[PDB]
Design a protein around this ligand. Sequence first.
Ligand SMILES: CN1CC/C=C/[C@H](OCCN2CC(F)(F)C2)[C@@H]2CC[C@H]2CN2C[C@@]3(CCCc4cc(Cl)ccc43)COc3ccc(cc32)[C@@](O)(C(=O)NS(=O)(=O)N(C)C)CC1=O
Length: 155
Amino acid sequence: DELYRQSLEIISRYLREQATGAKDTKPMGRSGATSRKALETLRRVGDGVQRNHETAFQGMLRKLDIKNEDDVKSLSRVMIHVFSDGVTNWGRIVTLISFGAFVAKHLKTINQESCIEPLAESITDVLVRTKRDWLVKQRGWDGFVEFFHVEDLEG
Ligand SMILES: CN1CC/C=C/[C@H](OCCN2CC(F)(F)C2)[C@@H]2CC[C@H]2CN2C[C@@]3(CCCc4cc(Cl)ccc43)COc3ccc(cc32)[C@@](O)(C(=O)NS(=O)(=O)N(C)C)CC1=O
């Protein structure tokens, strides 16, 4: 399952990078060039979403009351409720992943770093396993990179 593997790698790296503040130096697996550009895109676009919606992000986190492994496990049900049961577009996918990074940073601050990788698997599961058809039709991560591509300015 190339799409799942690639999705997991991108999502995991972003969540880990966000939580630790350090870049992972290990090579990407398959389709490395696209995965690199996807991660760079998430860095640009996800960071903005977290700031543009700072108050709501803090509010949702407080509402979820995330303390440990059991609470982190319960998030899949909530992701299905909120994300899967709605329209699909790249903006909503970025918000899914960006709030994931927001949760990962919370896990770091409460010294629950070990829950970050399971969280990343949970997000990947919801995204790929409920929206595969849409993702394929939109050209997957290549489509993601193309969608958010910014032209160089003249002059
Ligand atoms: C306009 N926006 C961004 C702003 C919305 C912020 C939202 O808060 C609204 C105000 N609430 C927070 C409160 F304090 F409880 C009062 C939530 C902050 C995270 C937003 C909820 N989640 C986050 C969520 C759901 C919660 C659990 C979760 C966990 C992980 Cl690890 C990752 C993602 C998620 C599913 O992913 C989302 C995808 C798309 C949208 C919203 C998603 C959205 O696509 C979406 O559908 N949001 S919404 O259902 O709440 N509604 C505003 C349309 C995001 C969107 O439209």
